[PDB]
Design a binder for this molecule. Sequence first.
Ligand SMILES: O=S(=O)(O)OC[C@H]1O[C@@H](O)[C@H](O)[C@@H](O)[C@H]1O
Ligand SMILES: [Ca+2]
Length: 487
Amino acid sequence: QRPNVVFIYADDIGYGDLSCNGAKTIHTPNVERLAKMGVRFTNAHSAAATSTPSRYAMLTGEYAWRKAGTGIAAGDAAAIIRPERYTMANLFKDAGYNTGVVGKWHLGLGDKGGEQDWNKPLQPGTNDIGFEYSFIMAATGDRVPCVFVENDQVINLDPNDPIQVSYKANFPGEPTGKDNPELLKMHPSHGHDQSIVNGISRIGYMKGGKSALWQDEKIAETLTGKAVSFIEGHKSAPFFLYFATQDAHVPRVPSPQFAGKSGMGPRGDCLLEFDWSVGEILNALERLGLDKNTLVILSSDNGPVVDDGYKDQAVELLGDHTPGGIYRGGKYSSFEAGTRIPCIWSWQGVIRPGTVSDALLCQIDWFATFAEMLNVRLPEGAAPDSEPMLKAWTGKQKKGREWLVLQNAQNNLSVTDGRWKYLRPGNGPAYLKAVNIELGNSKEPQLYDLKKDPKEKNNVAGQNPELVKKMAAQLEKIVDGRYGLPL
Ligand SMILES: O=S(=O)(O)OC[C@H]1O[C@@H](O)[C@H](O)[C@@H](O)[C@H]1O
Ligand SMILES: [Ca+2]
């Protein structure tokens, strides 16, 4: 098997945010098309409940929590994945695929954080760790620098107006969302009150690069355009395309063709904008007859958040829409909604269409699963936590992983066998008011029967001492002593 592999990888899109998992409160027709065209997963997880660790886990096949510095990265964060590492991109390139990444990166660029010259080539970047083509946002939509990077170079730079970036202090004379809120077309709810770009304040300060600044209205359009351009450009030979959307992540600034259309304000409108992007990819493959020999994978980097730092009506217009489906918590949390994400695999003539799998799966296993598919032996040390299971990911086998370690925003761990879930005691608040999410951090051990109690309402650690011991021990077995070590 040497098929094309296309990831459509969403940001902050929860189990109940797409209509494929049963929601009647939003209509995502293209995502339903994909589901009825392949296999839909009800128990597939991101490695982490935040972006940078989930993305690190996926491309490296290593649990993010094994390394300090794999947490939510700043725009000016240095390359977390160094060229010495064997990457999923490397696997494909070495197997003779063309490789491209389009959209959100959020794994750092350049050598030393806060010291990059954004007017010069970023070294090292995406093109040093197995990607032949890159068209990326440095970090998230709400983080400076708000420019696009093509093959590790910022595009549309006027050298008479060079970019500067600091997360330490403002450049004197540059206004902020905090001090100059009259310059804003969208107001912050918490943080997001530093440098201004197209009337929206961000996290971090910048100056110059006016010509290189993106427009948030046209991000979905620009990224999806480059994604389709890349599929059209490589229609003759095997390619791996990692298409990672801005969509559902703040600031939520959908194309005018989507403003108002969901009734749930910008947040809902950006789910429809995501569904549009999915449409563009599926149609490009169908136009070119690429649906004969293409594996399409749709998923999210982590669970959902309603208010994630802007006054964008997300709370007021949610109605009875449940982003996390029936599952407790959301983004940042130890609870299921933090990591249990929409996941579809579609592969014509391999995967039975309209199929469902309750297998315990994780995005960390794709690396090893693609080695199994390509029938190639992984180098010593590569994808160390990645468990191969092509049979499970193609819906031909009920049984997924036997054990899975999940991580939250405070880097506390949980372990599950698909049925029981043990949350290891750790530091951190029980609740974040700003984001209105239960984080699941506790000094007390927690045990939940996800089959009898999927809402994780009823902690039964006390009533199952022998089971708590078995699963505490199993967690540490998988941790080794390799937790929070240096990059
Ligand atoms: O998905 S993530 O990229 O990990 O999100 C990172 C988050 O950091 C937090 O400081 C903000 O409240 C969020 O708005 C978002 O920027
Ligand atoms: Ca995210």
